[PDB]
Scaffold this active site. Structure first.
Site, PDB file in Angstrom:
ATOM      1  CD  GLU A  10      52.371  18.572  67.197  1.00 36.59           C
ATOM      2  OE1 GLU A  10      53.060  18.001  66.317  1.00 36.59           O
ATOM      3  OE2 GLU A  10      52.826  18.922  68.314  1.00 36.59           O
ATOM      4  N   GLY A  60      34.861  34.904  45.651  1.00 36.98           N
ATOM      5  CA  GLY A  60      34.973  34.541  44.254  1.00 36.98           C
ATOM      6  C   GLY A  60      34.133  33.325  43.910  1.00 36.98           C
ATOM      7  N   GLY A  61      33.677  33.277  42.655  1.00 36.85           N
ATOM      8  CA  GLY A  61      32.917  32.127  42.198  1.00 36.85           C
ATOM      9  C   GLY A  61      33.754  30.868  42.094  1.00 36.85           C
TER      10      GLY A  61
HETATM   11  N1  LIG Z   1      43.890  39.371  49.936  1.00 38.06           N
HETATM   12  C1  LIG Z   1      43.582  39.207  48.652  1.00 38.06           C
HETATM   13  N2  LIG Z   1      42.257  39.137  48.280  1.00 38.06           N
HETATM   14  C2  LIG Z   1      41.923  38.969  46.984  1.00 38.06           C
HETATM   15  C3  LIG Z   1      42.901  38.866  46.008  1.00 38.06           C
HETATM   16  N3  LIG Z   1      42.282  38.708  44.817  1.00 38.06           N
HETATM   17  C4  LIG Z   1      40.945  38.706  45.021  1.00 38.06           C
HETATM   18  N4  LIG Z   1      40.709  38.876  46.358  1.00 38.06           N
HETATM   19  C5  LIG Z   1      39.401  38.912  47.032  1.00 38.06           C
HETATM   20  O1  LIG Z   1      38.650  37.800  46.582  1.00 38.06           O
HETATM   21  C6  LIG Z   1      37.292  38.140  46.401  1.00 38.06           C
HETATM   22  C7  LIG Z   1      36.893  37.852  44.957  1.00 38.06           C
HETATM   23  O2  LIG Z   1      37.187  36.513  44.629  1.00 38.06           O
HETATM   24  P1  LIG Z   1      38.260  36.091  43.496  1.00 38.06           P
HETATM   25  O3  LIG Z   1      39.335  35.179  44.044  1.00 38.06           O
HETATM   26  O4  LIG Z   1      38.862  37.316  42.854  1.00 38.06           O
HETATM   27  O5  LIG Z   1      37.334  35.318  42.424  1.00 38.06           O
HETATM   28  P2  LIG Z   1      37.749  33.895  41.797  1.00 38.06           P
HETATM   29  O6  LIG Z   1      38.128  32.894  42.858  1.00 38.06           O
HETATM   30  O7  LIG Z   1      38.864  34.108  40.801  1.00 38.06           O
HETATM   31  O8  LIG Z   1      36.421  33.334  41.076  1.00 38.06           O
HETATM   32  P3  LIG Z   1      35.794  33.955  39.724  1.00 38.06           P
HETATM   33  O9  LIG Z   1      34.386  34.416  40.027  1.00 38.06           O
HETATM   34  O10 LIG Z   1      35.759  32.862  38.686  1.00 38.06           O
HETATM   35  O11 LIG Z   1      36.641  35.106  39.246  1.00 38.06           O
HETATM   36  C8  LIG Z   1      37.170  39.615  46.729  1.00 38.06           C
HETATM   37  O12 LIG Z   1      36.698  39.735  48.052  1.00 38.06           O
HETATM   38  C9  LIG Z   1      38.589  40.132  46.649  1.00 38.06           C
HETATM   39  O13 LIG Z   1      38.797  41.196  47.541  1.00 38.06           O
HETATM   40  C10 LIG Z   1      44.240  38.937  46.371  1.00 38.06           C
HETATM   41  O14 LIG Z   1      45.122  38.847  45.514  1.00 38.06           O
HETATM   42  N5  LIG Z   1      44.573  39.107  47.699  1.00 38.06           N
END
Ligand SMILES: Nc1nc2c(ncn2[C@@H]2O[C@H](COP(=O)(O)OP(=O)(O)OP(=O)(O)O)[C@@H](O)[C@H]2O)c(=O)[nH]1
Ligand SMILES: Nc1ncnc2c1ncn2[C@@H]1O[C@H](COP(=O)(O)OP(=O)(O)CP(=O)(O)O)[C@@H](O)[C@H]1O
Ligand SMILES: Nc1nc2c(ncn2[C@@H]2O[C@H](COP(=O)(O)OP(=O)(O)O)[C@@H](O)[C@H]2O)c(=O)[nH]1
Ligand SMILES: [Ca+2]
Ligand SMILES: [Ca+2]
Ligand SMILES: [Ca+2]
Ligand SMILES: [Mg+2]
Ligand SMILES: [Mg+2]
Ligand SMILES: [Mg+2]
Lengths: 54, 438, 352, 425
Positions: free
Chosen positions: B254, B143-144
């Protein structure tokens, strides 16, 4: 196969088993990096507006 | 008692954070409204569970947590969810438009405008702490926000809380549940800038959690809820020592002392067993030897890789439930004579074992079945370097053509930061090879 | 339509397998860097095992077992035999060997001299051979001074093992030889022995009074074809196959190839492969492995079989390429990727 | 609240835009008067992306209708859903553009553009958080082409950090109004190369061939062609209009589809495409086979003539998501030669439970393929056959344009073709 440091309490216990013995940037520098990137964005947008003005 | 503050960044961090605090509450007997009947000290106390929960005069136990996301949709779920009453608004921070899966957008463009606000909200939690240990940071690599803003936050945390430890729970990108093509870029950009600021990071590969859900839980197409409940079980197993009476991993320090002899190599492999389907008629309860022996199966590792072809630097065994030290030693001895376990010569060949008599708590109506005993192994294997290799390879494939680089340069990032971050990863893979291979 | 990649252009074996796969019309070769493959015919060195088995919806198979180098390296094999309880240091089918690092770099120098000095005092045969994996570089001598000085002039690890001074000599010719056995291990760790072996014979009379001229002492196909003057005299290409060899054992020694030699070869193959199965098995792995091995054996005048080494990237006799390569497609590839006998292999059953 | 502002310009733009709002309005349960009458909360979850909420629970499309003659927009206002549009959002002149890019871009269009921007600014000022814009227009005419690209240039000046998206109908000699369409298209393509983030290339020849050969329509009309565009526009915007995770907004879609700034021209596809055997159930394998078949694509380019940089697929309806993954992976794993190997996992798949009206399930295809250069090569060749004789130029020089501007558009589009060629190898 030795057990050491056995600690026990009401909610569990822990120990160690040994099988074999062995043989930053300052707050100032962060703002500069952030402002340098903001400046490059402003410069790029200025060139875009300049291009559109022509 | 020393407090721990949890920070959840981006959708992955927030949603995983939601699942953990739900589990934490079920484990400590805290109700959705925050009340805790078993807490006889009303409005205060320095019990082990207070490391994660503060208390109000009204008897509410409030998580020591901050949720941050540059878009409000995910965090609104927390505001209106089952545990909406646990948190107060200051704890939930949401912007109006996200980072568009663009590290540079989360770190620079948007990050610069919100960083001071998040620090202010964290400072409020720190001011309630009489002896803050450090932070637990949940976020994704792809994610960004989870990648770009986290690295910014970690840099500032080291400046504002120099002497505090910082642990990470990071989601490694897996295409089966990912739709962003640039996630290899973001993962490597955020690892480069965060590496010197994180004392210990537990990587979870979504690929591994995905296959465990389909194989052991018989979920044909797992959802984020399925993935997150499993992840929170592992997270809970790792943080239990901080929330319960004990003597192993009793404070964040730890974790580094026991798992990270070399600072850059701070990514322990997590392995969890057993994972049993709740829809099963009824399962034969595994012994201590069987669940211990399961810790050396690639199938239940949070990152698929072959520890047989690396070298161990440390190994923790965290048991929960009906487990006595005698049975652990017996199982351990049996596994040595059968398994390939090579330690680095400059480390002892041994295991730190922690046992918590309370068996794993399962969310009612969830997918996991109640088991009498479970274990989570934390081992620092050079074999987890396979994960960096996979990621660095994909990075090289796109970067050779400069594909998508304009999105990052357009947000004020310099192209040279790509190669800079990649060279750091190249050195990281070289460190693993120096420690693991002959 | 199954897909495969080719990352070892120098493999005569898998060049044929690739040729046969395409002939089926159900296999498609991709560029060597395309990750969406079912089968990898991988490179010999630094094969990226860590990138296998991470493609959603692709059962990925590779033609090399990660960790099998422990068996197919000169020094590694010695270390494996001396440290593995399944093989033990008293292993009766492997020549007394020692790992010797050149003095410009554990090391078994003193342990070798001790055993060497014992033989010298007991009037026993004290002829040793020095070799390494970095050779085309071998020395045969009865003086420990020459063996050790020869390794110090080099810069890689070497192994000193007892030289079989009493090898079985074929007649006519009074000539040495070695036996090459091809063994294929599939993804389920079934051990299949190719019914067809080859004897790489020396076309020069064995001369125990001169280890300086190494043409009658080394049975390498390349050495006999370059430095021997009787190449191809007794058999084509210094290669006698089992049918001829078996008929020889019956006419000369009144025995058979199965009883006198093959039982020991099958026993040694099992012991070596079963030893490392827990370390290299892909039973519960996210990808699958198979591998073809080339075992090299020695036979002494007592009809006892000794193991010389194991080759992880072996070639095959020109006459047997068609049959063996087809067998690799049947048991190792089609067994995982089926298509739309009288097996040519001998299954060596064992306890997993 | 990630609002999108819609703009439809010219005859083609307003006729296709009208049908588009007709299709999605039915999907969201909005009747011709703006009143919601659906039965699912999924319909209203993301309704504010394309609709404003007025008093009395009325939903008014966030659309601006632009043209240099009144004719077409009078038909819209009197059309089926004509009453659903905000009356103030009708901005039109009387002169017309005579299928002349220079009239839409430099003379007639320039006189009306400011008033259009006054309405755009009005809609943007009321957006909680504006994503960007989407423009529907043709490139072969004068208003949608010449004034459309003028509006984009002036919108980018005032909203430089918002995503600009267009649905662009490319002219074809088989479905041609005037012989100057290649002139107007070549002039517009250069504007799009510079000022749009995403352009869905819709070739009127592909629409015609699909209507004639696949749909078995003996005599296709513009109305028949617009039915395909309707269904396609609804398919490529599903990700924006319903709860989802992949390509959820315009900027995230761009970040996953555009590896290079100028190569942002997409080939859309749709499935099924059945002739009236129309009641037969369509399996997931069939949906996938057709969606990737060239005959189901509306760029009039053979995908097997190029390579896919990135692909975005959207499956609609109650179907096995497990079985969707299997068939998608099967297409990639059976034709991985048509996908560039230097962009790992460049094929993304999204699902949606609400299917289009009258279909159990459908699939929409969005490909960023280097084969699109064939479309720009056709236009370039047609342009040059006339420009080498300066034929029909007087229509343009009479509006103040010089030949040099034509020579530059020519070179600009040949550059684009060469840019696609270097990545195809
Ligand atoms: N295990 C798990 N992975 C997640 C989940 N939500 C998103 N991901 C993973 O996170 C990655 C995408 O990043 P996100 O966290 O959705 O993006 P962000 O941090 O919200 O950043 P933005 O670009 O602003 O939306 C992908 O690889 C998804 O598979 C979740 O609820 N559980
Ligand atoms: N201990 C020993 N006693 C007698 N002869 C030996 C020996 N070790 C090696 N040799 C001779 O050396 C030859 C091959 O040596 P070795 O196999 O170590 O080299 P190499 O690996 O380059 C040939 P290949 O890999 O094809 O088997 C054999 O034919 C054998 O006759
Ligand atoms: N698909 C489609 N194309 C159209 C329609 N009307 C016109 N066109 C095409 O658009 C071009 C003419 O542009 P037009 O929109 O009529 O000119 P404008 O009003 O000045 O923008 C020609 O290539 C026509 O084939 C329509 O309703 N549907
Ligand atoms: Ca208390
Ligand atoms: Ca620090
Ligand atoms: Ca006028
Ligand atoms: Mg997000
Ligand atoms: Mg060899
Ligand atoms: Mg017209």
């Amino acid at each position: 196969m030795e057990v050491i440091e056995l600690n026990k309490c009401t909610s569990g216990q822990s120990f160690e088993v040994i099988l074999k013995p062995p043989s930053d940037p300052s707050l100032e520098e962060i703002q500069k990096k952030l402002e340098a990137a903001e400046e490059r964005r402003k410069y790029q947008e200025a060139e875009l507006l300049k291009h559109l003005a022509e | 008692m020393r407090e721990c503050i949890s920070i959840h960044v981006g959708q992955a961090g927030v949603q995983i954070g939601n699942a953990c605090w739900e589990l934490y509450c079920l484990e400590h007997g805290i109700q959705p409204d925050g009340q805790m009947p078993s807490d006889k000290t009303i409005g205060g106390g320095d019990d082990s569970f207070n490391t994660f929960f503060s208390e109000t005069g009204a008897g509410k136990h409030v998580p020591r947590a901050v949720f941050v996301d540059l878009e409000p949709t995910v965090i609104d779920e927390v505001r209106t969810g089952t545990y909406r009453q646990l948190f107060h608004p200051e704890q939930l921070i949401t912007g109006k438009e996200d980072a568009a899966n663009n590290y540079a957008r989360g770190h620079y463009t948007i990050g610069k405008e919100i960083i001071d606000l998040v620090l202010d909200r964290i400072r409020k939690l720190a001011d309630q702490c009489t002896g803050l240990q450090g932070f637990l940071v949940f976020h994704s690599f792809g994610g960004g926000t989870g990648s770009g803003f986290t690295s910014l936050l970690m840099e500032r945390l080291s400046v504002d809380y120099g002497k505090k430890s910082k642990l990470e729970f990071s989601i490694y990108p897996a295409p089966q549940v990912s739709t962003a093509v640039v996630e290899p870029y973001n993962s490597i950009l955020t690892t480069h800038t965060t590496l010197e600021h994180s004392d210990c990071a537990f990587m979870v590969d979504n690929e591994a959690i995905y296959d465990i859900c389909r194989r052991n839980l018989d979920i044909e197409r797992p959802t984020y809820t399925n993935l997150n409940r499993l992840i929170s079980q592992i997270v809970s197993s790792i943080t239990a020592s901080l929330r319960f009476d004990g003597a192993l991993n009793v404070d964040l320090t730890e974790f580094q002392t026991n798992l990270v002899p070399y600072p850059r190599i701070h990514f322990p492999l997590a392995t969890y067993a057993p994972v049993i389907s709740a829809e099963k008629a009824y399962h034969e309860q595994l012994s201590v030897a069987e669940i211990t022996n399961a810790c050396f199966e690639p199938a239940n590792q949070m990152v698929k890789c072959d520890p047989r072809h690396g070298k161990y630097m440390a190994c923790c065994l965290l048991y929960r439930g009906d487990v006595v030290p005698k049975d652990v030693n017996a199982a351990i001895a049996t596994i040595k004579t059968k398994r390939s376990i090579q330690f680095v010569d400059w480390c002892p060949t041994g295991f730190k074992v922690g046992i918590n008599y309370q068996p794993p708590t399962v969310v009612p109506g969830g997918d996991l079945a109640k088991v009498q005993r479970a274990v989570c192994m934390l081992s620092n294997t050079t074999a987890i370097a396979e994960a960096w290799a996979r990621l660095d390879h994909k990075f090289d494939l796109m970067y050779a053509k400069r594909a998508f680089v304009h999105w990052y340069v357009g947000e004020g990032m310099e192209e040279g930061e790509f190669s800079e971050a990649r060279e750091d990863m190249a050195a990281l893979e070289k460190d693993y090879e120096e420690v693991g291979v002959d | 339509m199954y897909t495969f990649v080719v990352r070892d252009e120098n493999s005569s074996v898998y060049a044929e397998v690739s040729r046969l796969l395409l002939a089926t019309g159900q296999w498609k070769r991709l560029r060597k860097d395309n990750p969406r493959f079912n089968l990898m015919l991988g490179e010999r060195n630094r094969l990226p095992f860590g990138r296998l088995g991470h493609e959603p919806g692709l059962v990925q198979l590779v033609n090399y077992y990660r960790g099998a180098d422990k068996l197919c390296r000169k020094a590694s094999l010695v270390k494996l035999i001396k440290t593995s309880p399944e093989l033990s240091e008293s292993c009766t089918w492997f020549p007394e060997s020692y790992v010797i690092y050149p003095t410009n770099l554990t090391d078994e120098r003193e342990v070798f001299l001790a055993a060497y000095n014992r033989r010298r005092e007991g009037r026993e045969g004290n002829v040793w051979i020095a070799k390494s994996s970095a050779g085309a570089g071998i020395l045969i001598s009865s003086e420990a001074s020459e063996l050790l000085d020869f390794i110090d002039e080099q810069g890689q690890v070497h192994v000193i093992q007892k030289y079989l001074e009493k090898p079985l000599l074929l007649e006519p010719g009074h000539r040495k030889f070695d036996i090459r056995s091809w063994v294929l291990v599939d993804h389920l760790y079934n051990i299949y022995l190719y019914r067809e072996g080859v004897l790489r014979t020396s076309s020069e009379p064995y001369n125990s009074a001169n280890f300086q001229d190494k043409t009658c002492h080394l049975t390498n196909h390349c050495i006999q074809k370059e430095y021997s003057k009787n190449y191809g005299r007794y058999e084509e290409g210094n290669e006698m196959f089992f049918e001829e060899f078996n008929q020889y054992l019956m006419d000369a020694l009144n025995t058979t190839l199965e009883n006198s030699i093959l039982l020991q070869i099958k026993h040694i193959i099992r012991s070596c492969l079963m030893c490392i199965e827990p370390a290299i098995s892909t039973k519960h792995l996210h990808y699958q492995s198979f591998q073809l091995f080339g075992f090299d054996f020695m036979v002494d005048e007592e009809l006892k079989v000794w193991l010389i080494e194991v080759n992880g990237a072996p070639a095959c006799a020109q006459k047997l390429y068609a049959e063996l390569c087809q067998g690799i497609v049947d048991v190792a590839i089609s067994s995982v990727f089926p298509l739309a006998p009288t097996s040519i292999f001998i299954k060596l059953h064992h306890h997993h | 609240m990630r609002e999108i502002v819609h703009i439809q310009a010219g005859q083609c733009g307003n006729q296709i835009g009208a049908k588009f709002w007709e299709v999605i309005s039915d999907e969201h349960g909005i009747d011709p008067t703006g009143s919601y009458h659906g039965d699912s909360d999924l319909q209203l979850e993301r309704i504010n992306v394309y609709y404003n909420e007025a008093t009395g629970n009325k939903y008014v499309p966030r659309a601006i209708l632009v043209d240099l003659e009144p004719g077409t927009m009078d038909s819209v206002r009197s059309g089926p859903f004509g009453q659903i549009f905000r009356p103030d959002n009708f901005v039109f002149g009387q002169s017309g553009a005579g299928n002349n890019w220079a009239k839409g871009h430099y003379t007639e269009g320039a006189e009306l553009v400011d008033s259009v921007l006054d309405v755009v600014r009005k809609e943007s000022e009321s957006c909680d958080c504006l994503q960007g814009f989407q423009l529907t227009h043709s490139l072969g005419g004068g208003t949608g082409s010449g004034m459309g690209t003028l509006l984009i240039s002036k919108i980018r000046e005032e909203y430089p950090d918002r995503i600009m998206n267009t649905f662009s109908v490319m002219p074809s000699p088989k479905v041609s109004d005037t012989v100057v369409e290649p002139y107007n298209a070549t002039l517009s393509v250069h504007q799009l190369v510079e000022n749009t983030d995403e352009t869905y290339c819709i070739d009127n020849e592909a629409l015609y061939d699909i209507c004639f050969r696949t749909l078995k329509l003996t005599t296709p009309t513009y109305g028949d062609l617009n039915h395909l565009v309707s269904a396609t526009m609804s398919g490529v915007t599903t990700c924006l209009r319903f709860p989802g995770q992949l390509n959820a907004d315009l900027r995230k879609l761009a970040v996953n589809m555009v590896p290079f700034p100028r190569l942002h021209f997409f080939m859309p596809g749709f499935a099924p495409l059945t002739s009236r055997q129309q009641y037969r159930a369509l399996t997931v394998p069939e949906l996938t086979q057709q969606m990737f078949d060239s005959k189901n694509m509306m760029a009039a380019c053979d995908p097997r003539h190029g390579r896919y940089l990135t692909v975005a697929a959207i499956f609609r309806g109650r179907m096995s998501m497990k079985e969707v993954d299997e068939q998608m992976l099967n297409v990639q794993n059976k034709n991985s030669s048509y996908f560039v190997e230097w962009i790992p996992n460049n094929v993304k798949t999204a699902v949606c439970d609400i299917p289009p009206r009258g279909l159990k399930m459908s699939a929409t295809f969005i490909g960023n393929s280097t084969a699109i250069q064939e479309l720009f090569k056709r236009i370039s060749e047609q342009f040059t056959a006339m420009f080498r004789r300066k034929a029909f130029l007087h229509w343009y020089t009479g509006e103040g344009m010089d030949e040099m501007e034509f020579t530059e558009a020519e070179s600009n589009m040949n550059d684009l073709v060469s840019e696609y060629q270097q990545y195809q190898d």
